[PDB]
Ligand binder design. Structure first.
Ligand SMILES: [Ca+2]
Ligand SMILES: [Ca+2]
Length: 643
């Protein structure tokens, strides 16, 4: 059993919902109970958003007492997405997106969505491709790019080509369906051309605008084939190899014309069509995701290339060329910022090879959908930037192709009363933040988790008469990754970002402050954390963490480069009830401690401190990958609680 058993890929991109907005309270995903949330400039965790009325924490949109089923939508364009993200500080959601940005649903409000996630596989590191709105993000899905170099009609930061227009003003880069067409791969866009909410970006391209009505580009890309036609194709065993579905406005899940319950109803209709023929369904993978987050808050700091400085230098470093990531033309606002990745959105992977309520925490974006098609059918998309190929995955890790399951679907909630539900709930008052802000809560509980291609380290070195801490960002795994470095002693400048491709390393230096103090928090994928605190101006302790996955062990090297011995204590923070070990390390030597991580499912969270220092700290947390499936963080729900 393997990827070649997929005969049909179906892609349903809905509209305008962030991951936390739906699933911040879903057990077993990285939600409001995240133990590894990033800090804001004031030193509090990212939840503590502030605006003109003070702090507004995430708060529940209660569809039983308010009209939040039809909440008023929030800003979602390039400038306000960049404003909220604020170069990765993640601290301006309220002025950029309004107080409605911080509202979230719970299970009782969106039962169908929860049931889909619990029946299949939910991706909790799937990001939209572009910070802003609709057509830029959909251009990444269908073509891999928004033309950042601006010589084929871009750069695209607006929706101004989401409709028909003069041939000579159409975009002129190549679309992925054209490459499929030429390779003989069958493909179709299912939509109503009279009501597709301008959610088909192919209409913006010269080669489609100029095409004859019997062109395969028009017949398959810009014609009306509704869900009745989809179901007929499934029953006839004539479903294409690659299908996109583009919902009507009312059913798109967008807050403007739609709602979660109408989006669920339409998704249910898609499921009814695709399951109509069991033989066809047994060979089908359905991907359901969102084009962007509206302006709804999501707390995960998006992976992104370093920003471009005025002098051509970068703030951060990258092993992968990031030329195509920077906004350098067009809109004068936010020049030299990266275009993405944008905030997390829901991605559901629904197939015979993705049942069971799994979570997958590999970083993906909309180009990952194309990458999945590259892996399966072999048609390459050269528009995808090298940075996106390094940092975003190909979706294959979201499946287990060796264990197909062709039983009937679990029951999913009924959506037939959607119209009556909305009609009743719009009679309720508009949702508002609570008078007293309170932290959101996520229930504890573990979810089976897919194996991830990540093996990462951050190794520190400092010198006695030195001015700075040297960090090595080491990627010894099979997929690239972004490390985000927060300087907890600098509340003004933005965090630095380091892109390290698979089997590579980067190095940088980090200065002490006036006293020689440093305090750095380094975040990576799926809860990866390395903390460095100390003073640079007796023992000189250091640690080096290495994985021994074949034996299920973590190797902790305790190093002393100083002239006197030091007692170093290794303390568990959450998985072993605060277990501690103490090691005396002679001058100019090192000593080793090994931990078997079997009892915690390869999760670890330890802090190393030195007797006689109130400041020195090395903290390390994450999950040690070993190629086998695992579980979500058993501590999800605990927030910053530590022993
Ligand atoms: Ca949208
Ligand atoms: Ca739209």
């Amino acid at each position: 059993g393997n990827l070649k058993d997929v005969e049909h890929v179906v892609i349903l991109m809905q509209e305008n919902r962030s991951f936390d907005h739906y699933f911040g309270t879903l057990k077993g995903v990285r939600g409001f109970g995240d133990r590894m949330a990033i800090p804001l400039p004031d030193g509090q965790r990212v939840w503590h958003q502030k605006g003109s009325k003070g702090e507004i924490l995430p708060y529940h949109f209660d569809t039983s007492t308010t009209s939040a089923q039809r909440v008023d939508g929030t800003p979602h364009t390039w400038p306000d997405a960049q404003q909220a993200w604020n170069e990765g500080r993640m601290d301006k959601w309220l002025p950029a997106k309004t107080e409605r940005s911080l509202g979230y649903y719970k299970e009782q409000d969106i039962a169908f969505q929860f049931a889909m996630a619990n029946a299949f596989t939910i991706c909790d590191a799937y990001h939209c491709s572009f910070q802003g709105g609709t057509n830029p993000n959909r251009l990444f899905l269908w073509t891999g790019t928004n033309d950042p170099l601006g010589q084929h009609g871009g750069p695209v930061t607006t929706n101004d080509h989401d409709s028909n227009g003069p041939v000579e003003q159409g975009y002129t880069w190549t679309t992925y369906p054209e490459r499929l067409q030429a390779a003989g791969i069958t493909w179709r866009v299912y939509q109503d051309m009279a009501d597709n909410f301008s959610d088909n970006p192919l209409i913006g391209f010269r080669q489609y605008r100029a095409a004859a009505p019997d062109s395969p580009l028009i017949v398959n890309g810009l014609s009306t084939w509704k869900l009745d036609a989809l179901k007929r194709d499934v029953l006839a065993n004539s479903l294409p190899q690659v299908s996109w579905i583009v919902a009507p406005a009312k059913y798109s899940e967008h807050p403007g014309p739609s709602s979660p319950i109408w989006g669920a109803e339409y998704t249910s209709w898609v499921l009814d069509a695709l399951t109509a023929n069991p033989e066809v369904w047994s060979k089908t993978a359905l991907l359901v995701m969102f084009d962007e987050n509206d302006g709804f808050f999501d707390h995960i700091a998006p992976p992104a290339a370093p920003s471009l400085n005025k002098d051509g230098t970068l703030r951060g470093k990258t092993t992968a060329d990031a030329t195509l990531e920077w906004h350098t033309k067009g809109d004068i606002r936010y020049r030299n910022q990266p275009y993405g990745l944008g905030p997390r959105v829901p991605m559901y992977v629904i197939s015979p090879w993705s049942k069971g309520g799994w979570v997958n925490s590999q970083v993906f974006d909309h180009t990952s959908v194309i990458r999945f098609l590259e892996q399966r059918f072999g048609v390459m998309e050269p528009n995808i930037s090298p940075w996106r190929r390094a940092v975003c995955g190909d979706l294959t890790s979201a499946f287990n192709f060796a264990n197909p399951n062709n039983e009937p679907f679990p029951e999913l909630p009924d959506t037939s009363q959607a119209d009556a539900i909305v009609a009743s709930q719009i009679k309720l008052p508009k949702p508002k933040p609570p008078a007293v802000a309170a932290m959101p809560k996520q229930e504890m509980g573990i979810r089976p988790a897919r194996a991830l291609p990540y093996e990462l380290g951050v190794h520190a070195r400092y010198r006695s008469g030195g001015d700075a801490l040297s960090l090595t960002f080491a990627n010894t795994g099979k997929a690239g990754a972004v490390f985000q470095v927060f300087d907890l002693l600098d509340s003004e400048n933005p965090p630095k970002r380091y892109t390290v491709g698979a089997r590579k390393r980067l190095h940088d230096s980090f200065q002490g402050d006036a006293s020689g103090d440093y305090h750095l928090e380094v975040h990576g994928p799926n809860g990866f954390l390395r903390v460095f605190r100390g003073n640079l101006a007796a023992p000189l302790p250091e640690v080096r963490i290495d994985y021994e996955p074949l034996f299920g062990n973590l190797r902790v090297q305790l190093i002393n480069r100083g002239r006197h011995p030091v007692k170093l204590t290794v303390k568990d923070n959450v998985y072993r009830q605060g277990e501690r070990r103490t090691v005396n390390v002679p001058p100019g030597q090192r000593r080793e401690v090994r931990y078997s991580l079997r009892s915690s499912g390869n999760w670890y969270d330890f802090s190393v401190s030195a007797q006689g220092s109130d400041s020195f700290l090395r903290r390390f947390s994450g999950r040690m990958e070993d190629g086998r499936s695992g579980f979500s963080d058993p501590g999800m729900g605990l927030g910053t609680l530590t022993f």
